[PDB]
Amino acid sequence: ALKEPPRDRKKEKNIKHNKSVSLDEIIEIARTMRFKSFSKDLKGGVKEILGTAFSVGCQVDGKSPKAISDAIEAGEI
Amino acid sequence: SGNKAGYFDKLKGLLEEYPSIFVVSVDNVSSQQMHEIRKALRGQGVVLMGKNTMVRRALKTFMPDHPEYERLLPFVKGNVGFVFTNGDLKEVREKILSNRIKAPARAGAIAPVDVWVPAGNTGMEPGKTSFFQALGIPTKIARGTIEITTDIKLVEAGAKVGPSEATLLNMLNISPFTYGMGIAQVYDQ
Amino acid sequence: MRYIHSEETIPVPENLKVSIKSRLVTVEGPRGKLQKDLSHIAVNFSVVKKGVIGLEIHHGSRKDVAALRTVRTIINNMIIGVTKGFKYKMRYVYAHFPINVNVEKNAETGCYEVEIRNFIGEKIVRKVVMAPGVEVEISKAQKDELILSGNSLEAVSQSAADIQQICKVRNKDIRKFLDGIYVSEKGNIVE
Amino acid sequence: IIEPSLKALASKFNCDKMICRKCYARLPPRATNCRKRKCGHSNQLRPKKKLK
RNA sequence: CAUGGAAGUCGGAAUCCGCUAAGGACUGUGUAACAACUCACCUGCCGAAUGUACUAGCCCUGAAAAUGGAUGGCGCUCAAGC
Ligand SMILES: [Mg+2]
Ligand SMILES: [Mg+2]
Ligand SMILES: [Mg+2]
Ligand SMILES: [Mg+2]
Ligand SMILES: [Mg+2]
Ligand SMILES: [Mg+2]
Ligand SMILES: [Zn+2]
Question: Is the CB of D38 under 7 A from strand E?
Fold first, then answer.
């Protein structure tokens, strides 16, 4: 849903890789809907999961979704 | 073999902290069953089973931390798991017995007891009558529903179930198999 | 490199009798009697226990040791045949011309012979006579089945292979002309 | 026409084979060396190509 | 994400985490697509060796000519061969 601007019609015929989205607490807020559906202990694993889930987007700017999830240094909530 | 090395410290660390160990005899049980019982017992107790421990408990038996391990040495035979928990033995007697699944037949599974279909109305679409005619079951269509007038023996106890009857058994939601957790003798009780 | 001692054992059920003399095996049980001659192999037979037969080779080479398991399985097959018998099943496969067979009864002696007509629409009448001790039936369980049964695996299998080998197509592409008679199932008479 | 299971049974005996590249001998599907002596037990085998 | 439709399996580029001894942004089949099945992988049995390349001794294929034929002959196999 976040994507990039609006996915206007007749634009998906060519490459549609312009779906870059920001990497911030907005994704962590969106993770509460899933709420660690499959175990994940206290949802720390789910937090890493959802963070690295947008691996195509490569997070925002220099930071990468995989690097962000791999580095266990952020707050739980 | 990183997980192989990681298993050793977990087993020795976990055995000493928990004074109570419960043995479980689980065999041919679906993965989802262990998933659900793991989530049910997630708050209290941790369940973990693995390959046979030929010398990994014998090393704990050599040194004196628990003289009672060598009493439990001969109890391991095969496909037996261990449960580490801190709850009472009385309360854990029937704690893990929940969620007994209703295993369907597997096209030839030996039925221990004779299987019978009680008289009644099946209620399904009458397009399936070819399945009944395959076994030659006397069926009469009433109000668009197939009704079995007279009970017909499906398979003798201890005999292989016919593939057509076994397939019909899936949609009929009746089977002789009920799979559940197995309780083994623990601490010579 | 010569191996000092190689040994194998065969258990024997409490139903049949076995006697060996000059490396000649005689097996007799509820369903009949069989004979085999093994004078061409240097093996030492012995009775290990109350119901176990042992056989072994001393100072044998690799090639000599190889035959020990063959001998063991042959005698085990004899035991199976004398206590449960054998049964083979075969199927007929034709595309256009139906193939007709006639398994007439004993021809004044114990041998059976099966007559095959109308193979790929040919007017040859072709005749094969099987070894004694093999019983042939046309199945009534379902359509287009031939049943072979007997006591000895070697004779039952050889007769079946004779039937398989007699129906051959010549001067044609066999990837296209799949006409013929083939074996489809092997098992025991009991269970 | 031939029902598929019978066609598979018949194909098992004359379609799924290995072919030696030196003497054109028929070999079992999983064989690795030719059994004939005139080619020297060569290990240059190719599958029998199907008909299509 | 495109998408009748393509929940791995026209496809594009990515390819993470949960819980395990292991069970996948999937190993195929299958299917509108899924599911299913299987595979992979670990475990239940088991009971001591295994796999992958190379090196050289003997033997074999590679090894087709004209009168009948020559390790000197007969013959020889834990040799009467090396
Ligand atoms: Mg031609
Ligand atoms: Mg030479
Ligand atoms: Mg010479
Ligand atoms: Mg000389
Ligand atoms: Mg010598
Ligand atoms: Mg001399
Ligand atoms: Zn060859």
Answer: yes
